[PDB]
Structure 1
């Protein structure tokens, strides 16, 4: 499988909304789609799992949605800490695949 994130780079003001897209070369179950946030100098952390479910400790400013081959991550209000690299991840065929990531 190939996981395609877009845009490679996203840029907008703090306090505004951002939508991050992830597209699959094949259908992915919602239960198998997750989003991660990797801040500079830090390990990746889970934000969204199951397409839409927030991970523990994650603000409600983050939400996910989508199905099949089209998933999104939405940040309703961007804070200074949110300007990081986000990844989408898929599970299937006993393997875990990440997208190339996008920088906010």
Structure 2
């Protein structure tokens, strides 16, 4: 398996602040990474696919970057509503895997 690693389980930010959540692959997955948002009592929500591409309906203040092994998720202006856990996932090979998570404050 490929190991998605979000070395930070938590990250504190404020409204209007910029925050970047990193994910690292145990091996080269190119752009084959996807990010999700799980709010309290809500289901996972695809925000990014293929490392950087935003899915349909996703706001503009969310962005992501990375290739190969080092990857990063970003929010330019955090909003109260952005309160959620965030997971990276590799979509490069079998089996599919997720990051540990980075519960955002």
Tell me which interval the TM-score lies in, with the shorter structure as reference length.
over 0.9
Task: Note the aligned Cα RMSD (angstroms).
Answer: 0.9
1:61-76 matches, within 5 Å, as: 61-76=61-76
Establish whether residue 16 from structure 1 lines up as the match of residue 17 from structure 2.
Answer: yes
- Give the SS at the match of 2:16: coil
Give TM-score scaled by structure 1 length: 0.94
- Give the SS at the match of 2:11: coil
Q: CA deviation at 1:92?
A: 3.0
Establish whether residue 56 from structure 1 lines up as the match of residue 44 from structure 2.
Answer: no
Q: CA deviation at 1:29?
A: 1.9
- Aligned residues between the structures: 103
CA deviation vs aligned residue, 1:46-90 (integer Å, no higher than 9, x gap): 001110001111101011111011000010000011121000000
Q: CA deviation at 1:91?
A: 1.9
Establish whether residue 97 from structure 1 lines up as the match of residue 97 from structure 2.
Answer: yes
Q: CA deviation at 1:7?
A: 1.6
Unmatched segments (≥5 aa) in structure 1: none
- Give the SS at the match of 1:71: strand
CA contact (8 A) 2:51 2:71 kept: yes
CA contact (8 A) 1:6 1:20 kept: no
Moved over 3 A (4+): none
